[PDB]
């Protein structure tokens, strides 16, 4: 049953009540598991919008990085969970954290063809020039993968960056 589940599994399953009890019976709201994942990260990775909101409101650290330098943001960006991404951005989280996978939230959003995530990240100052291990930046990924709608959004932003440099 629920008692045999980690606080992380409860978050990921969207078990609001059970989670709410576990984090009040002890200070496990920011407890990292073996991979360094927090309950917030598990909720983000599984699209549990209501749980993400509850956790954030109750003091879950949105900026904590996992052992691979994963964030709740990068996990939610890779899956295109636009509402969760917005909530994390509203917390003032860093958007340019480079992880041990050679990724950033923007690179993940582009890779997943998640155009709304891409727009949000760019507005929060995500850098479209940061590259993967293989030397692909956000524009390079969009072009190669054939994500023309993402490419269009990045292009409009690049024009603005260019206008600022001139």
């Amino acid at each position: 049953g629920a008692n045999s589940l980690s606080v992380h599994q409860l978050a990921a399953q969207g078990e609001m009540l059970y989670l709410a009890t576990r984090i009040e019976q002890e200070n496990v709201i920011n407890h990292t598991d073996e991979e360094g994942f927090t309950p917030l990260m598990w909720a983000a990775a599984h699209g549990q919008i209501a749980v993400v909101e509850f956790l954030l409101q109750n003091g879950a650290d949105p900026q904590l990085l996992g052992k691979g330098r994963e964030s709740a943001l990068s996990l939610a960006c890779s899956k295109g969970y636009t509402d969760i991404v917005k909530m994390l951005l509203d917390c003032g989280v860093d958007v340019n954290e480079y992880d041990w996978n050679g990724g950033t939230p923007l690179l993940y959003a582009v890779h997943g063809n998640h155009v709304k995530c891409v727009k949000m990240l760019l507005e929060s100052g995500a850098d479209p020039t940061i590259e993967t291990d293989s030397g692909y930046n956000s524009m390079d990924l969009a072009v190669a993968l054939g994500y023309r709608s993402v490419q269009q959004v990045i292009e409009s932003h690049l024009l603005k960056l260019l206008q600022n440099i001139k």
Binding site: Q13, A45, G68, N101, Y108, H111, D133, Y136
Partner: peptide
């Protein structure tokens, strides 16, 4: 059918 470990995809 239980939620899988969070994992970022390869890029």
């Amino acid at each position: 059918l239980l939620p899988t470990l969070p994992k970022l995809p390869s890029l």
